[model samples]
Target: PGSDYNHWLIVMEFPKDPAPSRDQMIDTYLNTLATVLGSMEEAKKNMYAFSTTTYTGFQCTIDEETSEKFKGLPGVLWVLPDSYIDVKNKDYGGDKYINGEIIPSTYPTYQPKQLEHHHHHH
Candidate 1:
């Protein structure tokens, strides 16, 4: 509710078991906005889904009219500031990403770990 043109960070909470695939999750996202904002097309343009599709969340640039409408939706976990001041963290920028594969930080279920515990056996 900061301002009409401002972006909002929206989080969603879905069931832990039997989650849908990426496309299906996006569909659910589109459908929710359609229900509140009146059209899927408008919603799609204003929102960006994470490339890590399984992340149960998306962010949108919403107007005053739709911002209030967004909060009451059932699946929405929370809505908050989208500005880097609020959301982004300080980094020294070691920045070892891209070519490196990493799981979504908050992704549920499991991601297979690529390393093992080590110990000095006597």
Candidate 2:
């Protein structure tokens, strides 16, 4: 229940002649994401999540008005709502495991004390 919610996968296409540079494309995506997310007050009420991939694809959550604003951006191929996958899995033991604080006694732990000593001496 912690930030696990429905989101949209925004798929946009870059211009053919000169696809915007990777950084420019990412910047545009972020700006567009912000604009769309800001367009809807209802979106603010929900647990919104957003991320962009190297392929210029974006994943985010938005309301009706926000979706519309995103659709209006240039180079936008299509905008659609899709279910998001929950990347976290904590079926092991307790909340601590889920929170990534698994103790060595309960789970396997990596020992790096020797590596740290070597690095310090270097």
Work out the TM-score per prediction: 0.57, 0.45
- Give the residue spans of candidate 1 off by over 4 A: 1-5, 51-55, 85-122
Can you write out model 1's per-residue Cα lDDT over 1-122, one digit (the tens) per residue? 12234565555666658866766665676677667778877776666433223235555667656667778888887665443311244211111122123234333332212112366899
Give the Cα-based TM-score of candidate 2 against the true structure.
0.45
Per-residue lDDT tens digits of candidate 2, residues 1-122? 22233345466676768857755655565666656566333333332322233234454545555666667687776665544132264212111211112222222232211112245655
The prediction achieving the highest lDDT against the true structure is: 1
* Pairs clashing within candidate 1: none
Model 1: weakest 10-residue lDDT segment is 91-100
Count of clashing residue pairs in every prediction: 0, 0
Q: What local lDDT score does residue 68 receive in model 2, on the 0 to 100 scale?
A: 68
